[PDB]
RNA sequence: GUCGGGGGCAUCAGUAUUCAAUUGUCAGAGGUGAAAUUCUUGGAUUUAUUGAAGACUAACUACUGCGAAAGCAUUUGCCAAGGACGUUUUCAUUAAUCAAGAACGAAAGUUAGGGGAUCGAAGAUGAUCAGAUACCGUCGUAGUCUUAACCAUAAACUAUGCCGACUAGGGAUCGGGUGGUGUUUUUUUAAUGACCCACUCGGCACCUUACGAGAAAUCAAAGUCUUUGGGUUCUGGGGGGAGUAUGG
């Protein structure tokens, strides 16, 4: 009979969701034969399967993350790699855990992560082979377990303090042999 | 330590009789030696599952049930209602940048020498005519919404029994005193009632139901 | 402003702009000479009242005081100036 | 029955992950010892190696009974740290899919708290 | 009439926190870049149930609202004042700053007590290989929280003393005041509330061309100063030596 996952959508991600529908189901419902229902008032991201919608074991595991990982700020391009690896995982931060941060110390230690015109962010976009989203304090990583170990040690001192050029000047002691 | 082999049988669980699906699945009981450990494990246990199972509605109704098992009747277990909460799936999916939460609580020695603690939370509303970014009540009206909801959770537990509370939830007649007797201040939307904590039974009776058998 | 004296402007442009900022000072509110539904005696309460009017025949509180102006009990006949 | 539901935890974390498979109660911990049996290494365990194979410590211990469907259950730490389904905490969702133990609940049991006590460290940094 | 995470006196709830027990248990977890520090077949750690303590009310949390400053975010009752606003109420100059003088005062620190939950400057341990660098880790007296009191220190900074004058130019804010033959649930087209178009004074802000400046970053005030004077208070005279000696 019926077999279901269920997830809702946070309402600051509602607005990047209803304008991002047109090419998320043709990469899903022509390969993954299902049906899902979007609406405007109950925010129900409803996806369920059946034995008639083949109930083979490894089919309810990585197909949800084409939109379950889109909702955490990523695009539809990166998250197909869930169905490529058994060591392709996610990482969610909470910025108020690195220190006791308060006030403009949570703006003078965010702006030194993306960098001036994304040029520290683009520089991490050639170091760990990841995608990293800045919502306000949500930072999410689609890496692969040793990439996110060196992505957790990529914001080792972007917050608590060392210069951003010394992210490749001082931290090159860690950013080489990139045990 | 004692008898490491024959700790194996399967006893199911009967839902409380006010709901649809009694027979909701077997569980592995390990007690053949002494039927008080097979009673202590079957006289006070919160066995939390979804309200999608009990009433029948495709939402895991957000409303999953603390369901304290009560008594044994022979390969079937007598039960009543204990409590309820919101799962974080719907509770967190609501909070936009510009609204205001409204919080309430009522604890009162209710009608069976029971003390029910009902949590009920409310939310402000961008009205259909609202062209503000926001909805903040004029914070006496943040108090005045919170002080006129203060009578609704009082009367709607002062008048009810233990049965009628869950039965006043499926269209939520409670809401039809929330949204019909606190609507007189500011517009509200997506408002609910949160938790049904019966933590204090300050009287625990002896216990022989015989009428919620199922 | 270019060439007009400020005895000779567009007149009512600054007329509601917070009484004293106008070209001379002239107060905002107004007088009313109204009669109660209990006596039909002209009981002049001020527009921005601060006193709850007991009737001159009854003991009825024929107004409720509020900021800005006050809030009368209905039944007061109005007329102009 | 055909649908005899169980409850299976995940315990999302770093440095290991824990598997706690007993049915519906806190009794006897049937398919549970500790879900870190499956490496030969020091700490190489939040990788899916004591994580994806820890659900294969219980892939044979669940079918001591033979139960088809369980309730999956993400769990965070419970405390004040960073709390999410992380790299060790998709893996107990990964291998229970591919071992025939069906998908249940989403209840990340942790406080997203209204308090915050004096955390681990000082003014010069808690974690990395 | 409002206003009110303003301040204060009790009550009071929260996710839970770790600590304590019951209860369920049967051989691993712990970190750091590799690693090194501990519990348990006399029951580990992922389970199920009840308390002490404290924290802060997480998300809603800002083009925020307030308060002399230090500061302050969940209810309810209690206490005055204040801020705004309205007024055709009362004093008729009661006034601005400020030598001397007096309140207050973060963090930290200082005496005498309460708890002693949380982490934790010092310290006691394991580190661990030459100074890939010593970032690691674990327990931690006091302290953090309060009570009768100090101290009188900050990048106490918007790096700009306080009362005056005007100008820009704006779409919003919030605290008040108003209702368009003004639009809808419904008190009954514009009621509770909230709106488009307008209007007013209070607080928090923003960005334009810079008329004026400045040496310059920039500033609607760091203006109306060589076209030098609205009023008043405290500092600075090259770098050091030095906020050092000396004295009060």
Swiss-Prot record, chain A:
The chain holds residues 93 to 271 of 274 of the full protein. Its main location: cytoplasm. Residues 103-155 form the KH domain. Belongs to the PNO1 family. The keyword Glycoprotein does not apply. The keyword RNA-binding applies. It is found in: Cytoplasm; Nucleus, Nucleolus. Keywords: Cytoplasm, Nucleus, Phosphoprotein, Ribosome biogenesis, RNA-binding. One of its GO terms (biological process) is endonucleolytic cleavage to generate mature 5'-end of SSU-rRNA from (SSU-rRNA, 5.8S rRNA, LSU-rRNA). It comes from Saccharomyces cerevisiae (strain ATCC 204508 / S288c). Required for small ribosomal subunit (SSU) synthesis. Has a role in the processing of early nucleolar and late cytoplasmic pre-RNA species. Recruits DIM1 to nucleolar pre-RNAs. Indirectly required for cleavage at the A2 site of the 20S pre-rRNA, forming 18S rRNA, and at A1 and A2 sites of other pre-rRNAs. Changing residue 143 to D: Accumulation of aberrant 22S and 23S rRNA intermediates. Component of the small ribosomal subunit, ribosomal RNA processing complex (SSU RRP complex). Interacts with NOB1. This is Pre-rRNA-processing protein PNO1. GO terms for cellular component: 90S preribosome; cytoplasm; nucleolus; nucleus. One of its GO terms (molecular function) is rRNA primary transcript binding. It comes from the Eukaryota. The gene is PNO1.
From Swiss-Prot, chain B:
One of its GO terms (cellular component) is cytosol. Coiled coil: none annotated. N-terminally acetylated by acetyltransferase NatA. Keywords: Acetylation, Cytoplasm, Isopeptide bond, Phosphoprotein, Ribonucleoprotein, Ribosomal protein, Ubl conjugation. GO terms for biological process: cytoplasmic translation; maturation of SSU-rRNA from tricistronic rRNA transcript (SSU-rRNA, 5.8S rRNA, LSU-rRNA). One of its GO terms (molecular function) is structural constituent of ribosome. The keyword Nucleotide-binding does not apply. It is found in: Cytoplasm. Present with 92400 molecules/cell in log phase SD medium. Component of the small ribosomal subunit (SSU). Mature yeast ribosomes consist of a small (40S) and a large (60S) subunit. The 40S small subunit contains 1 molecule of ribosomal RNA (18S rRNA) and 33 different proteins (encoded by 57 genes). The large 60S subunit contains 3 rRNA molecules (25S, 5.8S and 5S rRNA) and 46 different proteins (encoded by 81 genes). eS1 interacts directly with uS11 and eS26, which form part of the mRNA exit tunnel. Belongs to the eukaryotic ribosomal protein eS1 family. This is Small ribosomal subunit protein eS1A. It comes from Saccharomyces cerevisiae (strain ATCC 204508 / S288c) (Baker's yeast).
Swiss-Prot record, chain C:
Present with 43300 molecules/cell in log phase SD medium. There are 2 genes for eS27 in yeast. InterPro entries: Ribosomal_eS27, Ribosomal_eS27_Zn-bd_dom_sf, Ribosomal_zn-bd. It comes from Saccharomyces cerevisiae (strain ATCC 204508 / S288c). It comes from the Eukaryota. SUPFAM superfamilies: Zn-binding ribosomal proteins. It is found in: Cytoplasm. GO terms for cellular component: cytoplasm; cytosol; cytosolic small ribosomal subunit. Disulfide bonds: none annotated. The keyword ATP-binding does not apply. Its cofactor is Zn(2+). This is Small ribosomal subunit protein eS27A. Binds 1 zinc ion per subunit. Coiled coil: none annotated. HAMAP family: Ribosomal_eS27 (MF_00371). Gene3D superfamilies: Zn-binding ribosomal proteins. The modification S-methylcysteine is found at residue 39. Component of the small ribosomal subunit (SSU). Mature yeast ribosomes consist of a small (40S) and a large (60S) subunit. The 40S small subunit contains 1 molecule of ribosomal RNA (18S rRNA) and 33 different proteins (encoded by 57 genes). The large 60S subunit contains 3 rRNA molecules (25S, 5.8S and 5S rRNA) and 46 different proteins (encoded by 81 genes). One of its GO terms (molecular function) is structural constituent of ribosome.
Swiss-Prot record, chain D:
One of its GO terms (molecular function) is mRNA binding. InterPro entries: Ribosomal_uS11, Ribosomal_uS11_CS, Ribosomal_uS11_sf. N-terminally acetylated by acetyltransferase NatA. One of its GO terms (cellular component) is 90S preribosome. GO terms for biological process: cytoplasmic translation; maturation of SSU-rRNA from tricistronic rRNA transcript (SSU-rRNA, 5.8S rRNA, LSU-rRNA); ribosomal small subunit assembly; translation. It holds the Pfam family Ribosomal_S11. Residues 119-128 have a biased composition (Basic residues). Residues 108-128 are annotated as: Disordered. Its main location: cytoplasm. Keywords: Acetylation, Cytoplasm, Nucleus, Ribonucleoprotein, Ribosomal protein, Ribosome biogenesis, rRNA processing. SUPFAM superfamilies: Translational machinery components. It comes from the Eukaryota. It is found in: Cytoplasm; Nucleus, Nucleolus. PANTHER family: 40S RIBOSOMAL PROTEIN S14/30S RIBOSOMAL PROTEIN S11. Present with 29600 molecules/cell in log phase SD medium. There are 2 genes for uS11 in yeast. Belongs to the universal ribosomal protein uS11 family. Component of the ribosome, a large ribonucleoprotein complex responsible for the synthesis of proteins in the cell. The small ribosomal subunit (SSU) binds messenger RNAs (mRNAs) and translates the encoded message by selecting cognate aminoacyl-transfer RNA (tRNA) molecules. The large subunit (LSU) contains the ribosomal catalytic site termed the peptidyl transferase center (PTC), which catalyzes the formation of peptide bonds, thereby polymerizing the amino acids delivered by tRNAs into a polypeptide chain.
């Amino acid at each position: 009979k019926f077999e279901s996952r269920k997830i809702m959508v946070p309402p600051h991600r509602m607005t990047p969701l209803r304008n991002s529908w047109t090419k998320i189901y043709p990469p899903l419902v022509e390969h993954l034969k299902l049906q899902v229902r979007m609406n405007l008032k109950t925010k129900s991201v409803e996806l369920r399967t059946n034995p008639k919608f083949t109930t083979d074991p490894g089919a309810l595991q990585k197909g949800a993350d084409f939109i379950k990982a889109f909702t955490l700020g990523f695009d539809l391009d990166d998250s197909i790699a869930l169905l490529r690896l058994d060591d392709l995982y996610i990482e969610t931060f909470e910025v108020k855990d690195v220190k006791t941060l308060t006030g403009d110390h949570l703006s003078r230690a965010i702006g030194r992560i993306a960098g001036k015109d994304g040029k520290t962010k683009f520089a991490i976009e050639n170091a760990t082979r990841t995608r990293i989203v800045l919502a306000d304090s949500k930072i999410h990583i689609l890496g692969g377990f040793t990439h996110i170990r060196m992505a957790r040690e990529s914001v080792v001192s972007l917050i608590l303090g060392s210069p951003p050029g010394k992210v490749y000047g001082n931290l090159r002691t860690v950013a080489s042999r990139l045990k | 330590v004692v008898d490491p082999f024959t700790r194996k049988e399967w006893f199911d669980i009967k839902a409380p009789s006010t709901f649809e699906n009694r027979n909701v699945g077997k569980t592995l009981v390990n007690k053949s030696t002494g039927l008080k450990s097979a009673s202590d494990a079957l006289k006070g246990r919160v066995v939390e599952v979804c309200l999608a199972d009990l009433q029948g509605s495709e939402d895991h109704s957000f409303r999953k049930i603390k369901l304290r098992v009560d008594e044994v009747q022979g390969k079937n277990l007598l039960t009543n209602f204990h409590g309820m909460d919101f799962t974080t799936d719907k509770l967190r999916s609501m909070v936009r940048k510009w609204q205001t939460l409204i919080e309430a609580n009522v604890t009162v020695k209710t009608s069976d020498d029971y003390v029910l603690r009902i949590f009920a939370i409310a939310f402000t509303r961008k009205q259909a005519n609202q062209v503000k970014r926001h909805s903040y009540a004029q914070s006496s009206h943040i108090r005045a919404i919170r002080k006129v909801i203060s009578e609704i959770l009082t009367k709607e537990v002062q008048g009810s029994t233990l049965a009628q509370l869950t039965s006043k939830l499926i269209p939520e007649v409670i809401n039809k005193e929330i949204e019909n007797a606190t609507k007189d201040i500011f517009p509200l939307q997506n408002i609910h009632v949160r938790k049904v904590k019966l933590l204090k039974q300050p009287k625990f009776d002896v216990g022989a139901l015989m009428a919620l058998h199922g | 402003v270019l060439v007009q004296d400020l005895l000779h402007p567009t007149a009512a442009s600054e007329a509601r702009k917070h009484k004293l900022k106008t070209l001379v000072q002239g107060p905002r509110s107004y007088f009313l000479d109204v009669k109660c539904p209990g006596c039909l005696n002209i009981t002049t309460v001020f527009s921005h009242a601060q006193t709850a009017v007991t009737c001159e025949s009854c003991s009825t509180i024929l107004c409720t005081p509020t900021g800005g102006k006050a809030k009368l009990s209905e039944g007061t006949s109005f007329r102009r100036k | 029955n055909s649908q005899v539901f169980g409850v299976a935890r995940i315990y999302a974390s770093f440095n290991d992950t824990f598997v706690h498979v007993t049915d519906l109660s806190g009794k006897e911990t049937i398919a549970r010892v500790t879900g870190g049996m499956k490496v030969k290494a020091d700490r190489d365990e939040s990788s899916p190696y004591a994580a994806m194979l820890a659900a294969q410590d219980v892939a044979a211990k669940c079918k001591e009974v033979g139960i088809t469907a369980v309730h999956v259950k993400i769990r965070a730490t419970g405390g004040t740290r960073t709390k999410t389904p992380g790299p060790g905490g998709q893996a107990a969702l990964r291998a229970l899919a591919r071992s025939g133990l069906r998908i249940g609940r989403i209840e990340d049991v942790t406080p997203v708290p209204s308090d915050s006590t004096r955390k681990k460290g000082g003014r010069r940094g808690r974690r990395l």
